[PDB]
Amino acid sequence: LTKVIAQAHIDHFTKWFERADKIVIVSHVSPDGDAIGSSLGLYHFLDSQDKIVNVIVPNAFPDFLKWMPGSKDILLYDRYQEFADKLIMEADVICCLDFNALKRIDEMSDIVAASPGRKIMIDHHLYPEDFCRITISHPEISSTSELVFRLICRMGYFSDISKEGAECIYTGMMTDTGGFTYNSNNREIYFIISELLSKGIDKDDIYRKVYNTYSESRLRLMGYVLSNMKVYKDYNSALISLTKEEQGKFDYIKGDSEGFVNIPLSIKNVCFSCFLREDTEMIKISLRSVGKFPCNRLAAEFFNGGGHLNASGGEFYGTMEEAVKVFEQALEKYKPLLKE
Amino acid sequence: LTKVIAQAHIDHFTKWFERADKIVIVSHVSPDGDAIGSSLGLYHFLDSQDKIVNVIVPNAFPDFLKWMPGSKDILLYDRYQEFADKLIMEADVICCLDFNALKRIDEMSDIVAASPGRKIMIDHHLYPEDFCRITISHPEISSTSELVFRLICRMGYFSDISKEGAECIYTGMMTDTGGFTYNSNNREIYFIISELLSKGIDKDDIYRKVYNTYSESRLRLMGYVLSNMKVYKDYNSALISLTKEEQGKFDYIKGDSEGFVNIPLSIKNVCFSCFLREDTEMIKISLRSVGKFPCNRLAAEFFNGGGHLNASGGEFYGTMEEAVKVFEQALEKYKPLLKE
Ligand SMILES: Nc1nc2c(ncn2[C@@H]2O[C@H](COP(=O)(O)O)[C@@H](O)[C@H]2O)c(=O)[nH]1
Ligand SMILES: Nc1nc2c(ncn2[C@@H]2O[C@H](COP(=O)(O)O)[C@@H](O)[C@H]2O)c(=O)[nH]1
Numbered sequence: 010l011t012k013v014i015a016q017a018h019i020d021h022f023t024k025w026f027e028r029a030d031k032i033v034i035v036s037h038v039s040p041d042g043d044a045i046g047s048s049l050g051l052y053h054f055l056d057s058q059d060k061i062v063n064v065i066v067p068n069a070f071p072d073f074l075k076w077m078p079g080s081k082d083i084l085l086y087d088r089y090q091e092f093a094d095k096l097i098m099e100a101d102v103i104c105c106l107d108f109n110a111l112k113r114i115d116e117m118s119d120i121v122a123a124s125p126g127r128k129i130m131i132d133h134h135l136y137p138e139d140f141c142r143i144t145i146s147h148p149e150i151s152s153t154s155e156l157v158f159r160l161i162c163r164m165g166y167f168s169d170i171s172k173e174g175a176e177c178i179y180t181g182m183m184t185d186t187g188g189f190t191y192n193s194n195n196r197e198i199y200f201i202i203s204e205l206l207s208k209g210i211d212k213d214d215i216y217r218k219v220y221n222t223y224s225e226s227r228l229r230l231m232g233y234v235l236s237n238m239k240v241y242k243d244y245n246s247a248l249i250s251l252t253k254e255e256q257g258k259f260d261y262i263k264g265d266s267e268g269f270v271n272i273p274l275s276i277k278n279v280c281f282s283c284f285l286r287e288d289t290e291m292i293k294i295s296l297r298s299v300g301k302f303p304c305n306r307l308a309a310e311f312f313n314g315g316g317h318l319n320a321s322g323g324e325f326y327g328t329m330e331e332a333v334k335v336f337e338q339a340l341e342k343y344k345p346l347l348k349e
Numbered sequence: 350l351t352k353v354i355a356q357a358h359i360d361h362f363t364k365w366f367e368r369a370d371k372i373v374i375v376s377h378v379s380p381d382g383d384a385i386g387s388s389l390g391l392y393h394f395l396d397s398q399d400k401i402v403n404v405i406v407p408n409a410f411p412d413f414l415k416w417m418p419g420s421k422d423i424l425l426y427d428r429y430q431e432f433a434d435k436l437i438m439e440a441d442v443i444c445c446l447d448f449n450a451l452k453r454i455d456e457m458s459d460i461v462a463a464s465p466g467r468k469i470m471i472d473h474h475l476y477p478e479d480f481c482r483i484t485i486s487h488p489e490i491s492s493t494s495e496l497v498f499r500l501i502c503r504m505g506y507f508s509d510i511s512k513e514g515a516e517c518i519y520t521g522m523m524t525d526t527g528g529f530t531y532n533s534n535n536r537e538i539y540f541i542i543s544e545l546l547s548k549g550i551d552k553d554d555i556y557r558k559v560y561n562t563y564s565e566s567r568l569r570l571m572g573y574v575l576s577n578m579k580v581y582k583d584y585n586s587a588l589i590s591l592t593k594e595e596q597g598k599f600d601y602i603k604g605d606s607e608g609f610v611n612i613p614l615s616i617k618n619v620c621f622s623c624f625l626r627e628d629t630e631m632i633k634i635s636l637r638s639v640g641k642f643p644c645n646r647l648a649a650e651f652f653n654g655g656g657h658l659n660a661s662g663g664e665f666y667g668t669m670e671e672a673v674k675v676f677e678q679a680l681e682k683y684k685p686l687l688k689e
């Protein structure tokens with residue numbers, strides 16, 4: 010309903026749009042629901058508009074996202090670099106969805122930066138770089154998927170949004186809000202949900218296909234991590250872990266411990282959650298927080314990383330109680346902040 | 350938006366409404382989010398309309414529902430029967446929200462049935478009895494909370510719905526859809542969410558106050574049950590359990606194992622989930638299912654109970670592997686259905 014995107018930007022992109030013949034859509038390393046959804050959504054739109062479109066991500070994406078229309082044709086740069094470089098270098102327009110720093114598409118940086126094709130960035134993360142000639146950056150919006158839906162509507166093609174395109178955009182929105190349980194207080198989100206529903210999607214099904222589909226090993230693996238988690242009541246934090254030794258017990262396939270770092274946050278008075286997953290061999294740190302505790306800050310001040318205010322990670326080389334000690338001092342330092 | 354409730358019923362209730370001075374609102378035994386929310390919502394509305402209102406439930410309600418505006422004044426029939434009987438017998442109007450059979454308000458049946466006050470039933474469960482002079486029964490709607498919002502709007506008081514009233518109605522809707530993850534595919538649900546948001550509520554907060562607030566003992570208790578659950582891959586079912594012996598280990602307070610029977614349903618190809626919680630002393634059975642497997646049917650054909658298509662329970666007197674055996678034959682019988 011409300012105009013969030015600059016009408017100017019919209020007009021300028023519309024110009025590139027009609028002139029363009031070959032468009033390439035790119036997203037960040039380790040594509041997540043919003044990354045794949047927003048890109049597949051734009052892809053479907055652009056594709057119905059008599060245009061050559063190719064979605065290229067740096068990496069592989071979760072299996073719970075394979076059911077999406079078009080995922081099969083998403084080109085993974087780490088296995089077809091050659092082909093991709095050609096597509097990228099020959100593109101008229103290059104849409105960068107869901108990331109605002111070239112370092113984010115790690116590996117693809119060079120070729121994307123090198124391409125003479127005009128670039129446009131549609132994102133919602135804070136502090137956007139200026140490598141794109143057109144920049145649609147709105148941190149005030151919950152997902153890239155959502156403003157890809159706004160951009161298409163503002164351009165007058167709401168009617169041209171297919172059910173497949175609608176399924177993807179909704180997935181991206183759902184994902185970045187954890188099923189609309191955080192950063193979803195804006196009314197318009199629900200007007201859009203209602204509109205997508207009118208394209209024929211089954212939101213309840215999309216939900217199950219992403220969150221309620223996975224081996225009994227993963228769910229049991231979870232039950233394990235939960236029993237062994239440690240809760241530092243006075244620091245309002247919590248820590249869960251997994252050694253290569255443990256991973257082998259439950260036959261850990263990559264992606265099992267997903268969303269595990271979140272579970273601890275559902276405890277009454279625990280707003281900071283840490284997950285130390287011993288990488289096969291040193292320790293993989295994942296930070297999550299409800300409220301305003303800056304995870305990205307402790308992520309950089311103790312585990313050579315970064316990320317966002319509520320979610321971020323990084324690695325610490327050593328062992329289990331070694332990482333734990335590190336985490337435990339990080340806690341002692343921020344104990345007063347963790348108290349506010 | 351769409352007219353779901355019979356304009357006639359609305360007009361008839363409006364008549365009782367203006368004439369009435371003292372109104373009593375009742376809900377089902379073991380009130381859940383929809384029960385407390387829909388009742389507190391109507392209460393707040395009726396109360397702003399210069400009327401005497403009293404919410405009386407047969408039982409105590411979860412603590413994760415205590416934050417709601419007005420819960421403190423909800424009269425529990427099992428501790429103030431005398432007072433309540435007076436309120437009930439003297440009421441001009443008696444609203445029965447979220448149940449359609451007198452047996453549902455177990456204990457309160459007699460006095461409610463005896464009261465000369467005119468009754469109205471607002472519910473969404475299947476097969477409604479006819480003890481109320483006015484009956485608003487719509488199984489096609491996801492919550493009682495939702496059509497209490499429709500009834501108030503149809504009556505022309507959308508503007509008179511307070512933020513407190515809005516907080517309650519939203520909670521009821523969220524609860525009965527498990528955070529809008531099931532039976533929520535209807536567009537209008539989201540128009541209503543958007544409207545409530547405009548009353549000033551913080552849906553994200555309401556969410557955390559109900560689902561992300563509970564001791565580390567409960568979450569750990571869960572991690573335990575999950576590690577020990579059994580999955581009958583070929584029957585597409587799963588079973589989790591808790592003996593009084595176990596409950597004591599994790600210091601089980603009533604309500605800990607809530608929503609536990611659901612967790613197993615998130616496994617890829619497990620649509621039936623059984624929870625045998627050994628009651629302190631014989632076994633408490635809880636059945637849940639995704640899809641269409643009739644839980645209420647197996648609930649009655651093996652554990653002297655009943656309930657709904659997707660959720661229901663009942664008790665089986667004996668021991669752990671005794672209940673398990675029972676459950677295991679129930680499976681063998683319906684193995685072919687569980688296969689479709
Ligand atoms: N700069 C930086 N960011 C990271 C690192 N690890 C994780 N992140 C950020 O945090 C998010 C992932 O959190 P995770 O899923 O690993 O718990 C990603 O979106 C990513 O931007 C890291 O080592 N360095
Ligand atoms: N008739 C009948 N219904 C039950 C019984 N136990 C549970 N239910 C139904 O199933 C729901 C509770 O499922 P639960 O939370 O115990 O797993 C309630 O709404 C209730 O109507 C029982 O023993 N008899």
Ligand SMILES: [Mn+2]
Nearest residue numbers: 041043044107
């Ligand atoms: Mn993303």
Ligand SMILES: [Mn+2]
Nearest residue numbers: 043107152153
């Ligand atoms: Mn995003």
Ligand SMILES: [Mn+2]
Nearest residue numbers: 381383384447
């Ligand atoms: Mn109910």
Ligand SMILES: [Mn+2]
Nearest residue numbers: 383447492493
């Ligand atoms: Mn209900």
